Design a protein around this ligand. Structure first.
Ligand code: 1QA
Ligand code: FE2
Length: 231
């Protein structure tokens, strides 16, 4: 068992998969070691109180109906105690780079910072939605899962995706060391089923140069940073 080089994984799997299904799962992305360390950093961020109620971020008014029940924080990847999260990001960035020019007609010129989230279970999740419905510039959603030994049958927390105009849907378990890619626009409405155990995940959104430039000012979610370069 050996690591598939990014270029091969990108061109032989990710590109075809995305252009055909618009949804792509990559298991055993970084291996147990790196995976658990990312879990420790995230869990540490949580214990040291670095998260903020996700509901407060999305909501419009204080009377707005609950959209999400998670806690989050934005990580750039260089902050103290976030080095491994930074490695994750460089890894994601490396794959995207090899894909670039082969994912639809998109020209990916950057990404958002990493949105580290925690779903404290207790029936908390995220209601059905589209990440980028108004052309805010984000073309690909990338999510990395960190939940060691997860049984959706009793803990739930399944990510169910409904590809627009297709006779099928996708049920993604928030499996440890699993990386997920899917178009961020209306093609992928999705919902996070009720969770009953603490659930951690890290999301990065990649920008398309064209759509971003044509983006409305009206639209961290909007901050674009360059892909990481190999140290
Ligand atoms: N499994 C699983 C799983 C599925 N979906 C999601 C998320 N969907 C969104 C929707 C989105 O694109 N943008 C929000 C906005 O428009 O204001 C937003 C962006 C950044 C910070 C606060 C709010 C955010 S997180 C997740 O975290 C995990
Ligand atoms: Fe989402």
């Amino acid at each position: 068992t050996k690591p598939l080089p990014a270029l091969k994984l990108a061109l032989e799997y990710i590109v075809p998969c995305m252009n055909k299904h618009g949804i792509c799962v990559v298991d055993d992305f970084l291996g147990k070691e790196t995976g658990q360390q990312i879990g420790d950093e995230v869990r540490a961020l949580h214990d040291t109180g670095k998260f903020t109620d996700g509901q407060l971020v999305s909501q419009k008014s204080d009377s707005s109906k609950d959209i999400r029940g998670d806690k989050i924080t934005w990580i750039e990847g260089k902050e103290p105690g976030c080095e491994t999260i930074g490695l994750l990001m460089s890894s994601m960035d490396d794959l995207i780079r090899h894909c670039n020019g082969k994912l639809g007609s998109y020209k990916i010129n950057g990404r958002t910072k990493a949105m580290v989230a925690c779903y404290p279970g207790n029936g908390t999740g995220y209601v059905r939605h589209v990440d980028n419905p108004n052309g805010d510039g984000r073309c690909v959603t990338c999510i990395y899962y960190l939940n060691k030994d997860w049984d959706a049958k009793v803990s739930g927390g399944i990510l169910r995706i409904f590809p627009e105009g297709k006779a099928q849907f996708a049920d993604i378990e928030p499996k440890f060391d699993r990386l997920l890619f899917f178009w961020s626009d209306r093609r992928n409405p999705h919902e996070v089923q009720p969770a009953y155990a603490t659930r951690y995940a890290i999301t990065v959104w990649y920008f398309d140069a064209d759509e971003r430039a044509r983006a409305k000012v009206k639209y961290e979610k909007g901050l674009r940073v360059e892909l990481n370069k190999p140290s």
